[PDB]
């Protein structure tokens, strides 16, 4: 995260770290939406241009973490994957449309003070909150610049008007994507950066006090560049696939 600050302990109990076994390294962020299910970006697992195609045995899920590199004995919980589900229409050939994937954990994780699922929005929640100018929050252990942080970073970022998102890039934007970030003349800045891929863009509902995951860190050009914005997977628009996969598979 560029221009964020250190998270507080227990501030994002849904944040998950996707960790490669060999070599041992941070692959991506991810989020816990139930005791058995994790949500991330599909590009974290499959992206043929760079020959990436990870399967279940290649990875570990680390939940409850604060420190990027330390093994947080008695706090964090590590899990193995049972099955990975990538959206059948994820478009890695062109613009990363439908960038989303679900990961079925091998056994339920037990919740605690540091481990707790985020909610998935319904239509009414999405409609009330995903409005230009409203801020959401991105977290991750990724790059601080286009070194790496010792602890989870957090930044609050405003959703941007679809026209302005469309006029900042030559890549084709779809309705399954929204962009966020400060305008070059707003003074404030901040963005996700490499290693933050797959992590949660969340918002707190003022109606019922809950945190909802509105987006997934998907793509951008650089990190914190002026006149450029972060693009996120629109989680509500792909919710029917999510629900379909979880009730068709466990």
């Amino acid at each position: 995260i560029v221009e964020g600050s250190d998270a507080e302990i227990g501030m994002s109990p849904w944040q998950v770290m996707l960790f490669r076994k060999s070599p041992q390294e941070l692959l991506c962020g991810a989020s816990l939406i139930s005791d058995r299910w994790v949500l991330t970006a599909a590009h974290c697992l499959l992206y043929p241009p760079w020959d990436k195609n990870f399967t279940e045995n290649d990875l570990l899920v680390r939940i409850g973490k604060h420190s990027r590199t330390r093994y947080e004995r008695n706090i964090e919980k590590i899990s193995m994957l049972e099955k990975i589900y990538i959206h059948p229409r994820y478009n890695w050939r062109e613009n990363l449309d439908r960038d989303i994937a679900l990961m079925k954990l091998k056994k339920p994780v037990a919740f605690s003070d540091y481990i707790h699922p985020v909610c998935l929005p319904d239509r009414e929640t999405a409609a009330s909150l995903l409005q230009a100018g409203y801020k959401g929050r991105v977290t991750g252990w990724g790059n601080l610049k286009e070194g790496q942080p010792s602890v989870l970073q957090v930044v609050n970022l405003p959703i941007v008007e679809r026209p302005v998102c469309k006029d900042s890039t030559r890549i084709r934007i779809t309705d399954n994507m929204f962009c966020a970030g400060y305008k070059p003349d707003e003074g404030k800045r901040g963005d996700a950066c490499e290693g933050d891929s797959g992590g949660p863009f969340v918002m707190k509902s003022p109606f019922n006090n809950r945190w909802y995951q509105m987006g997934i860190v998907s793509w951008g050009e650089g990190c914190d560049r002026d006149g450029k914005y972060g693009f996120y997977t629109h989680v509500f628009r792909l919710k029917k696939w999510i629900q379909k996969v979880i009730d068709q598979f466990g």
Partner: peptide, 10 residues
């Protein structure tokens, strides 16, 4: 600089 995780999880 990742710390070694418990062998068990591997």
């Amino acid at each position: 600089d990742f710390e070694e995780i418990p062998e068990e999880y591997l």
